[PDB]
């Protein structure tokens, strides 16, 4: 399809660009760990950044530093999350995690530096004006810190052993922090770089992010973390499926001002449930 | 003296402004551990940010988010450094470390959010033009990441298990990364915000950063700096670098007075 071919292209370009940006750093164990953690993945957040840019008439070359920013940040968070003090993961996508391949010290440092790299990438003159770049840093920061991604991780610790079982509102607030905020930055990145209205892409992302999580739960159905309240347990199998579809249709509809230009973005929404 | 009063006023105002900045986040264990980590300390780096700005005719009000940015970044680094897998500290400034008071998970996360907050503070429009703000965050990213502070820390850890003890040339290059880079950002910050030449303040910071490091090793014995030079040699060497740092600021005339007083202060405790 257009979507699948466009995705493949973006994945190939991102792999190359990330390796080049990391290869610029001083050699050593730190850099090897950084490189290993930022390689592979579906690049869905890079996709969103590039496609939302394309919709505002911005080239992939002008958009690359923002796509790599959100991928670096995504990568940093997994490294920190795979640590024994947190999710305690030995393997990710069939492969050893950073803290296992190297050591815990390398994992905290590789993730720290990857965070730094993401913000540095946001200052790259290729992106365009200083005004737009400083709005991009601000938005990546809002998405990633103590009112965004990290906050959602803090809540997840309380949530996975909660006394009263988790309500729908709570697992929605969870989702919105853990994955929602960064998916939203990625989708808004295009508009940020064009200095354009961020409303439609925000609404598209809110709906898309939640749809992702709901679609994820359904796939798991079809210990503390394993027996947590999911959208399938709360809404039912059919209730979850119908909610996923509703949200995808809501995300597509948010992109109506863009006409046929939004094609790959609306196929991205459909992809999550299909 | 008159420097003593400038340092305490800045310490007071950094304490307030940081509590207000962290106060604006959602409540919880995370916000508590962040605010705890970012409270206190001598505010050296914040002082360098504010005072190099004053040297360039920029008020404290306009400089504050850059001072908060160094401090938040510094705090983040301490929280992560204290963890069992790194330096393994149980106390700092008397009180228990973040990992000890809470746990390892909270250390990671409060560290992470503190780095994120540091970069968020660099975008505060109070700092002035977006051009200077973007140069500020590029500088902070340079000081802090895989070419700066983090790189230095990684080298320091790899040092801990080296086949040979390290040369004085290497332990200079190590701590230029580990502590020098962030002090360099802090001194240059005032010039960045005025769109001015950064060279003199950079040379100041390179001298001062090394001297600050040597004066800390002096504290311990009172391959490190005291072991490689002796207590006679290191007390002399740090006093040399202080002079160097004061000399680097000769272009500024007697406007360099507070920052020179600061350079002498980091060895005035010895």
> SS3 for A255?
coil
Tokens matching residue A228:
């947590």
Q: Read out DSSP for B103-125?
A: -HHHHHHHHHHHHHHHHHHTT-G
Distance CA A187, CA A49 (A): 5
Give the one of B34, B135, B158 whose C-beta lies nearest to A146's C-beta: B34
Sign of CA pseudo-dihedral A123, A127, A133, A137: negative
CB atoms within 10 A of CB A181: 25
Residue pointed to by tokens 């190590």: B174
Distance CA A36, CA A23 (A): 12
Q: Any bridge partners for residue B219, and if so which? A: none
Cβ neighbours of residue B67 under 8 Å, at least 6 residues apart?
A: B10, B14, B17, B43, B45, B46, B47, B49, B50, B189
| Alpha helices per DSSP H over chain B | 2-23, 29-37, 44-54, 60-81, 98-101, 104-121, 130-144, 149-159, 170-175, 181-192, 199-220, 225-248, 257-268
Tokens matching residue A45:
């957040």
**CATH number of the domain bearing residue B215:** 1.10.600.10
Nearest Cα to Cα of residue B78 among B60, B98, B54, B95: B98
Distance CA B127, CA B55 (A): 16
Chain B residues whose CB is inside 8 A of the A117 CB are 141, 145-146
Per-residue CA distances from B40 to A258, B43, B252 (Å): 51, 8, 31
Tokens matching residue A110:
């590789």
Whether the Cβ atoms of residue A73 and residue A118 lie closer than 8 Å to each other: yes
Nearest Cα to Cα of residue A109 among B156, B33, B170: B156
Distance CA B147, CA A27 (A): 10
Tokens matching residue B41:
């300390």
Give the one of A28, A104, A138 whose C-beta lies nearest to B120's C-beta: A138
Whether the Cβ atoms of residue B106 and residue B33 lie closer than 8 Å to each other: yes
Nearest Cα to Cα of residue B223 among B177, B161, B168, B174: B168
CB-based contact B123 A142, cutoff 8 Å:
no
Distance CA B109, CA B112 (A): 5
Chain A residues whose CB is inside 8 A of the B104 CB are 85
Nearest Cα to Cα of residue A146 among B210, B94, B120, B154: B120
CB-based contact A141 B131, cutoff 8 Å:
no
Distance CA B32, CA A107 (A): 24
Interface of B with A in 17-36 (CB under 8 A): 25-26, 28-31, 34
- A176's enclosing H/E stretch is none
Whether the Cβ atoms of residue A264 and residue A190 lie closer than 8 Å to each other: no
B247: domain range? Answer: 1-270
Tokens matching residue A225:
């973390």
CB-based contact A151 B119, cutoff 8 Å:
no
Give the one of B34, B130, B145 whose C-beta lies nearest to A113's C-beta: B145
Whether the Cβ atoms of residue B201 and residue B52 lie closer than 8 Å to each other: yes
Distance CA A155, CA B75 (A): 22
Distance CA A12, CA A95 (A): 20
Tokens matching residue A187:
């989708």
Smallest Cα distance from B225 to chain A, Å: 25
CB atoms within 10 A of CB B254: 6
Per-residue CA distances from A192 to A48, A144, A202, B118 (Å): 13, 17, 11, 21
Distance CA A152, CA A159 (A): 10
CB atoms within 10 A of CB A263: 16
Distance CA A165, CA B198 (A): 57
Cβ neighbours of residue A95 under 8 Å, at least 6 residues apart?
A: none
Per-residue CA distances from A133 to A116, A119, B135 (Å): 15, 10, 10
CB-based contact B151 A26, cutoff 8 Å:
yes
Nearest Cα to Cα of residue A66 among A146, A135, A142: A135
Per-residue CA distances from A40 to A14, A43, B72, B131 (Å): 9, 8, 32, 34
Q: A139 to chain B: nearest residue by CA?
A: B120
Tokens matching residue B130:
């977006």
Phi, psi of B198 (to 5 degrees): -100, -20
Size of interface A-B (CB pairs under 8 A): 147
CB-based contact A146 B104, cutoff 8 Å:
no
CB-based contact A146 B117, cutoff 8 Å:
yes
Number of domains in chain A: 1
Tokens matching residue A83:
């640590």
Distance CA A270, CA A116 (A): 33
Nearest Cα to Cα of residue A70 among A99, A50, A89: A50
Whether B146 contacts chain A with CB within 8 A: yes
Distance CA B110, CA B76 (A): 7
Smallest Cα distance from B128 to chain A, Å: 11
Smallest Cα distance from A237 to chain B, Å: 33
Mutate to test the interface with B, among A105, A131, A152, A159 (most CBs of B within 10 A): A105
Tokens matching residue A98:
């950073």
Question: Burial code of B57-86, b = ≥16 C-beta within 10 A, e = fewer?
Answer: ebebebbbbbbbbbbbbbbbbbbbbbbebb
Chain B residues whose CB is inside 8 A of the A153 CB are 109
Whether the Cβ atoms of residue A74 and residue A182 lie closer than 8 Å to each other: yes
Nearest Cα to Cα of residue B111 among A49, A169, A153, A58: A153
* Degrees to nearest 5, angle at CA A107 with A104 and A108: 90
Tokens matching residue B251:
């272009």
> SS3 for A69?
helix
CB-based contact A133 B134, cutoff 8 Å:
yes
Interface of B with A in 105-134 (CB under 8 A): 105-109, 111-113, 115-117, 119-120, 122-123, 129-131, 133-134
CB-based contact B154 A30, cutoff 8 Å:
yes
Tell which phi-psi region holds residue A91, choosing left (phi > 0), alpha (psi between -120 and 50) or beta.
Answer: beta
Chain A residues whose CB is inside 8 A of the B33 CB are none
- Say what the resolution is, in angstroms: 2.2
* Degrees to nearest 5, angle at CA A214 with A209 and A218: 145
Tokens matching residue A31:
């850099």
Whether the Cβ atoms of residue B51 and residue B7 lie closer than 8 Å to each other: no
| Alpha helices per DSSP H over chain A | 2-23, 29-37, 44-54, 60-81, 98-101, 104-121, 130-144, 149-159, 168-175, 181-194, 199-221, 231-235, 237-254, 263-273
Nearest Cα to Cα of residue A171 among A247, A232, A231, A246: A231
Distance CA A162, CA A227 (A): 11
Nearest Cα to Cα of residue A104 among B104, B256, B164: B104
């Amino acid at each position: 399809s257009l979507f699948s071919e466009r995705l493949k292209e973006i994945q190939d370009a991102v792999e190359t660009a990330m390796a080049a940006a990391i290869g610029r750093l001083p050699a050593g164990d730190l850099r090897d760990a950084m490189a290993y953690a930022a390689q592979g993945g579906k690049r869905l957040r890079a996709f969103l950044a590039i496609e939302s840019a394309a919709i505002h008439g911005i080239s992939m070359a002008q958009a690359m530093p923002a796509a790599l920013a959100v991928e670096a940040l995504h990568a940093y968070s997994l490294v920190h999350d795979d640590m024994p003090c947190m999710d305690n993961d030995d393997l990710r996508r069939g492969l050893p995690t950073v803290h296992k391949k190297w050591d815990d010290a390398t994992a905290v440092l590789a993730g720290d530096a990857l965070q730094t790299l993401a913000f540095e990438l946001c200052t790259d003159p290729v992106l365009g004006s200083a005004e737009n770049r400083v709005a991009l840093v601000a938005a990546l920061a809002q998405a990633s810190g103590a009112e965004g991604m990290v906050y959602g991780q803090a809540l997840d610790i309380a949530a996975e052993t909660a006394a009263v079982p988790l309500t729908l509102d709570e697992i929605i607030r969870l989702q919105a922090g853990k994955t929602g905020a960064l998916i939203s930055f990625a989708a808004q990145a295009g508009a940020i770089l064009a200095g354009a209205d961020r409303g439609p892409l925000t609404a598209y992302a809110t709906a898309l992010g939640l749809a992702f999580q709901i679609a994820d739960d359904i796939l798991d159905v079809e210990d503390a973390e394993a027996h947590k309240a999911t959208f399938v347990s709360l809404l039912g199998l059919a209730g979850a499926k119908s909610r996923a579809a509703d949200l995808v249709a809501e995300a597509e509809a948010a992109l109506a001002p863009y006409g046929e230009a939004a094609s790959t973005l609306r196929a991205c929404a459909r992809y999550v449930i299909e």
